[PDB]
């Protein structure tokens, strides 16, 4: 067939329970992640071709950039508890990775700040326990999909993004490829 099980896609040996729809996972540690998000815009273009009724879910990893790194998922806490994700996934990348100027909590901060989040809004959500179960719960979903690295796709909380099974040539025809098997995997 088109798309098959050990090549665009692989399948959970054991399926994940409520889980969300679509889910990825990243680190703005991660320079496949920067690639993935702000050359590639893979999430963008996952979107853009989703049946009507699927959410696309986005959670943080903890596991790279020790303080930084859990610091780094307690703001994208933080974000999805204020719906600003869409604010700051740029700037929090770009200063992790292409300025590196985020170096503590602090400089977090400054960028949801410079985006237009008030100060005392941002520090009640970051010390809410709203924010500490948002966080507990993206923990929570690696450890369901078992997860192993950064970035990763799950469809329905059965299936498996494979991008290494895809084309890697045109940076276009790999995203398209990865597009149209989440779609489908959508509808499987």
């Known amino acids: 067939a088109q798309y098959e099980d050990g090549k665009q896609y692989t399948t959970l040996?054991?399926?994940?329970?409520?889980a969300p729809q679509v889910l990825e996972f990243f680190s703005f540690f991660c320079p496949h992640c920067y690639q993935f998000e702000e050359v590639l815009h893979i999430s963008d273009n996952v979107k853009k071709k989703l049946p009507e009724g699927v959410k696309m879910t986005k959670y943080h990893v903890?596991?790279?950039?020790?303080?930084?790194?859990?610091?780094?998922?307690?703001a994208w806490a933080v974000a999805m508890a204020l719906g600003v994700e869409d604010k700051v996934t740029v700037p929090?990348?770009?200063?992790?990775?292409?300025?590196?100027?985020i170096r503590s909590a602090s400089d977090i901060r400054d960028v949801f700040i410079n985006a237009g989040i008030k100060g005392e809004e941002y520090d009640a959500a970051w010390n809410s326990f709203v924010v500490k179960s948002l966080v507990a719960q993206?923990?929570?979903?690696?450890?369901?999909?078992?997860?192993?690295?950064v970035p990763a796709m799950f469809v329905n909380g059965k299936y498996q993004l494979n991008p290494q099974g895809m084309d890697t040539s045109n940076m276009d025809v790999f995203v398209q490829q990865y597009a149209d098997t989440v779609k489908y995997l959508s509808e499987k």
């Open 13 to 18: 040996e054991k399926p994940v329970a409520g």
């Open 62 to 74: 903890n596991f790279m950039g020790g303080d930084l790194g859990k610091d780094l998922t307690q």
């Open 92 to 101: 929090l990348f770009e200063g992790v990775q292409k300025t590196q100027t």
């Open 138 to 149: 993206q923990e929570k979903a690696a450890a369901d999909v078992q997860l192993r690295g």
